[PDB]
């Protein structure tokens, strides 16, 4: 099976709920493996404790900076960055899991979860997974965002790991 990973989301430390993701290792194996390993922490670093620093309601929730903790940082399991693996999958609607980047071939650890169809990102951001359970938790996270993405409370990955 494709891997399933989970995030336990917290709001100012209080548990909000669990979001689980299917990672499309069958189509995007290198990008899926990066996110999987960063979710388990097995390389000695990863998502646990990091925050969703940019939440834009009706657009997406972005997180994954566990090095600088401010939205500028990024570290993959392959180095600071890795190339865009492929653009097979598209941003088709809510729940799509895709890589944030600073341009072509700059994948690190930052990622975003779509809360709408975002077709203008197709071919620019590598889609590699989708929310499997807990989309209502992602929807609850949007209350803490704003038009420019600044969050009103600390939305964190309190725990994360691999289910299968």
């Amino acid at each position: 099976v494709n891997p399933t990973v989970f995030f336990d989301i917290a709001v100012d430390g209080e548990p909000l709920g669990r979001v689980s993701f299917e990672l499309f290792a069958d189509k995007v194996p290198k990008t899926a493996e990066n996110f999987r390993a960063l979710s388990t922490g097995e390389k000695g670093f990863g998502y646990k404790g990091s925050s969703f620093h940019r939440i834009i309601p009706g657009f997406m929730c972005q997180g994954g900076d566990f090095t600088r903790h401010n939205g500028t940082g990024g570290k993959s399991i392959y180095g600071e960055k890795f190339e865009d693996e492929n653009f097979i999958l598209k941003h088709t609607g809510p729940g799509i899991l895709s890589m944030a980047n600073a341009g072509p071939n700059t994948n690190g650890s930052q990622f975003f979860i779509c809360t709408a169809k975002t077709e203008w990102l197709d071919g620019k951001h590598v889609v590699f997974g989708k929310v499997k359970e807990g989309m209502n938790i992602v929807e609850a996270m949007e209350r803490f965002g704003s038009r420019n993405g600044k969050t009103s409370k600390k939305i964190t990955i309190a725990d994360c790991g691999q289910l299968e």
Binding site: G71, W120, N148
Partner: protein
């Protein structure tokens, strides 16, 4: 009641759009880099003896999907075109912003000021003459600034307001 101007600060990633704006608004400079999605500021100023309210839109250096960029170009009255004197790509990007603004506004006569920022730094890659000649080709002023030392900061924004006022006379 006083006149009010919608100003828009555009330019590539990291050229100092926010640092220029925060220096105008708050009179301080931060070395920290906090990338912008969109921020709005307001400030009451006196320019040439005329008191006015400036509505300043600080934009992202990275383009998203244009339809919302066309939005603030549609409503903006004057534009600061910012590059950094140590970032040649940011200077090369300038013509794209001017082209986009003229397209949305359907005019070759839109109030604009070319801003060469980071004029305190010793890593310069863009000659002043290059920027002066570019500004001449566009018929707009060129102002050299440093958000760090505050050099030219008021001048850049106030000159933009003067350009809007002059455009309104025609």
């Amino acid at each position: 009641s006083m006149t009010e101007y919608k100003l828009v600060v555009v330019g590539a990633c990291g050229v100092g759009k926010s640092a220029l704006t925060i220096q105008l608004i708050q009179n301080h400079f931060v070395d920290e880099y906090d990338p912008t999605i969109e921020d709005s500021y307001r400030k009451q100023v006196v320019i040439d003896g005329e008191t006015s309210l400036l509505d300043i839109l600080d934009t992202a250096g990275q383009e998203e999907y244009s339809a919302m960029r066309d939005q603030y170009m549609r409503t903006g009255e004057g534009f600061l075109l910012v590059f950094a004197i140590n970032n040649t790509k940011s200077f090369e990007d300038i013509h794209h912003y001017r082209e986009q603004i003229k397209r949305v506004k359907d005019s070759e006569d839109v109030p604009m000021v070319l801003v060469g920022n980071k004029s305190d730094l010793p890593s310069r890659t863009v000659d002043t003459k290059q920027a002066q000649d570019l500004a001449r080709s566009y018929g707009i002023p060129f102002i050299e600034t440093s958000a760090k030392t505050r050099q030219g900061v008021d001048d850049a924004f106030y000159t933009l307001v003067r350009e809007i006022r002059k455009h309104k006379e025609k």
